[PDB]
Ligand binder design. Structure first.
Ligand SMILES: CCNC(=O)N1CCN(C(C)=O)CC1
Length: 119
């Protein structure tokens, strides 16, 4: 991550772009496992092995409250969604697959966002 990712405070116009990124991932056909927090009745050990859970609804709450001060911090929470999934699930599970797909989409949208920031 370069000069501007780490450093640059997020402005109000930057926040309009982060909302748009987040809604694109929420609309993706492969987002379904990540839309809301993991239900412990589906995976009763999940919260004993994943130390820092994340999901897209918590990220939306944080975006609305202006939680994030730098782009790096938003990227960090998104990345955790995907890393948590690939650590918990085996490499041949549909959940692991979805993480693969959705992370590649995220990177495409994040590059779009960075390009838009300064011009
Ligand atoms: C839908 C229920 N199926 C499950 O076994 N899981 C596994 C853990 N998980 C994620 C997102 O990592 C979702 C819940």
């Amino acid at each position: 991550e370069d000069a501007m990712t780490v450093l640059t405070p997020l402005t109000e116009k930057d926040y309009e772009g982060l909302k748009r990124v987040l809604r694109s991932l929420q609309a993706h056909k492969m987002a379904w496992p990540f839309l809301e927090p993991v239900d412990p009745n589906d995976a009763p050990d999940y919260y004993g092995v994943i130390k820092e859970p994340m999901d897209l609804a918590t990220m939306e709450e944080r975006v609305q409250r202006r939680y994030y001060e730098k782009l790096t911090e938003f990227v960090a929470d998104m990345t955790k969604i995907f890393d948590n999934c690939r650590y918990y699930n085996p490499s041949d599970s549909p959940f692991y697959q979805c993480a693969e797909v959705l992370e590649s989409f995220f990177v495409q949208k994040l590059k779009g966002f960075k390009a838009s920031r300064s011009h």
